[PDB]
Design a protein around this ligand. Structure first.
Ligand SMILES: Nc1nc2c(ncn2[C@@H]2O[C@H](COP(=O)(O)OP(=O)(O)OP(=O)(O)O)[C@@H](O)[C@H]2O)c(=O)[nH]1
Ligand SMILES: *CC(=O)N(C)CCN(C)c1ccc([N+](=O)[O-])c2nonc12
Ligand SMILES: [Mg+2]
Ligand SMILES: [Mg+2]
Length: 166
């Protein structure tokens, strides 16, 4: 069966685990849990293709490490998540991008940008700038809430279409 190896990366606390769990299990997590790493597997249908998602939900560490590399290198496609009320998480997207490219030894890795917590108001990152970032990188941008579920299938199913097209 067609498997798609996805990895969800980004700064600590931006909602990588809430997005993934909302995908795997269709509910919202709201507890304090410093992920290390953990992988989810679910068979879903995408554009008529029955396939398997193999999702690696990483830690938001402040330090680079080979161990992280060891986990990351298996991924096919990366979901690069920030929170729209956390400016630092948005600046960090450049560093993830760079880290992903170095780890996959490639200049064109399937990747999508996500701005999570769209339910929360008084945002600190305007959509226009984030859309522009993605476009200067050549990749799609999706906005999302692990809370309302808005955009969550779009962000993930979208990364799959980037995997299929590279
Ligand atoms: N309102 C709102 N809260 C969110 C959203 N996504 C995550 N949160 C909350 O933000 C906090 C962090 O979520 P996590 O999913 O644990 O974040 P993370 O990126 O996995 O963090 P690390 O694994 O430590 O790197 C939790 O309190 C979540 O409930 C969202 O879309 N909206
Ligand atoms: C739930 C949790 O994160 N902890 C029990 C760790 C200790 N706490 C409360 C903690 C750690 C780190 C940071 N931080 O600098 O980001 C915290 N900010 O508020 N509580 C924090
Ligand atoms: Mg987590
Ligand atoms: Mg590309």
């Amino acid at each position: 069966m067609t498997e798609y190896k996805l990895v969800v990366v980004g700064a600590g606390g931006v909602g990588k685990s809430a997005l993934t769990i909302q995908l795997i299990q269709n509910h919202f997590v709201d507890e304090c849990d410093p992920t290390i790493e953990d992988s989810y597997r679910k068979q879903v249908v995408i554009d008529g293709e029955t396939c398997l998602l193999d999702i690696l939900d990483t830690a938001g560490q402040e330090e680079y490490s080979a161990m992280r590399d060891q986990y990351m290198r298996t991924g096919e496609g990366f979901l690069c998540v920030f929170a729209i009320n956390n400016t630092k998480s948005f600046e960090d997207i450049h560093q993830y991008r760079e880290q992903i490219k170095r780890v996959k030894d490639s200049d064109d890795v399937p990747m999508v940008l996500v701005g999570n917590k769209s339910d929360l108001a008084a945002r600190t990152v305007e959509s226009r700038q984030a859309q522009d970032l993605a476009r200067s990188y050549g990749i799609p941008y999706i906005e999302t809430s692990a809370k309302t579920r808005q955009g969550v299938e779009d962000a993930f199913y979208t990364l799959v279409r980037e995997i299929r097209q590279h």
